[PDB]
């Protein structure tokens, strides 16, 4: 749900309910070896080495 | 157009610069930065409070 | 079965759309099927 490019901009969480958006954010990630992350989660970024 | 969101993973040997670059592109960019590192944890109270 | 996905990627693509209005360069935003994958990326699914 984080790092849906959509589901982000109404991002929300336990403590305060309301929709934050995300949107304009920048995630990025870091693996020491790209093929251990499960694959639904894999697939979506690239995986530049 | 403007900025599209995309997910993006690196990956190679540890300590070959990949945060430095992160970072480097943080202030490319323009954007704020903040590294999270989520190594190991279960506890998706973390993420959502 | 049920209509909330669709209602969520519609508002996502609207509100881009906004932003495209409010601050963006054209005053009426034109959606066209071709246009939308620009607006909400490339699709995902297809392989059904
Ligand atoms: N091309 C490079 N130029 C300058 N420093 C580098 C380069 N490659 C690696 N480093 C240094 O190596 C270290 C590696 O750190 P970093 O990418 O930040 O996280 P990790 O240690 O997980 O790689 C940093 O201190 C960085 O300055």
Redo the contacts with the bound molecule.
Sequence with gaps: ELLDPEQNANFLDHYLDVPVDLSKVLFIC?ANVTDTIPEPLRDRMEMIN | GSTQGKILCFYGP????????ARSIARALNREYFRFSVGGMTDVAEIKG | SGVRNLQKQVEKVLRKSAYKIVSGEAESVEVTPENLQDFVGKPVFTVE
């Design positions: 870091t | 540890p300590g070959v610069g990949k945060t430095s670059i």
